[PDB]
Design a protein around this ligand. Sequence first.
Ligand SMILES: CC(=O)N[C@@H]1[C@@H](O)[C@H](O)[C@@H](CO)O[C@@H]1O
Ligand SMILES: [Cl-]
Ligand SMILES: [Cl-]
Ligand SMILES: [Cl-]
Ligand SMILES: [Cl-]
Ligand code: NA
Length: 129
Amino acid sequence: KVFGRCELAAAMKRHGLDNYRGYSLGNWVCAAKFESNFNTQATNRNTDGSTDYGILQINSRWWCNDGRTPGSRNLCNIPCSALLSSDITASVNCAKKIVSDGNGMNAWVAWRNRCKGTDVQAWIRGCRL
Ligand SMILES: CC(=O)N[C@@H]1[C@@H](O)[C@H](O)[C@@H](CO)O[C@@H]1O
Ligand SMILES: [Cl-]
Ligand SMILES: [Cl-]
Ligand SMILES: [Cl-]
Ligand SMILES: [Cl-]
Ligand code: NA
């Protein structure tokens, strides 16, 4: 599923991400835009052989099991394919674990480089939430 900007904002708000660990909703929308272009089916393979999955590009090195990342962890206790569904619940629940692990949203490279320090509220402007 390729979400619209405001559609994803409302889905994330419903799933409890607005101000989660102090990160306003626009941070989460900006991160999803630049990680996946709002596409739940996005996958990208990393140089270490791990793969990033879904709207928030969650890495199989630590967070999910894809059966082909030897020696990796599955800290969200989910198959990575669950992160590709049209229902963003699994991605949101895993992201809440990631952002709580001490490094905040710096775990998302695209957030650090393209959202952090910008006017992230622009990402939810005009949306009916
Ligand atoms: C929280 C998380 O899994 N972030 C991943 C990061 O590990 C990976 O290096 C990057 C690759 O572009 O995508 C995401 O930022
Ligand atoms: Cl915001
Ligand atoms: Cl594995
Ligand atoms: Cl959803
Ligand atoms: Cl933080
Ligand atoms: Na893994």
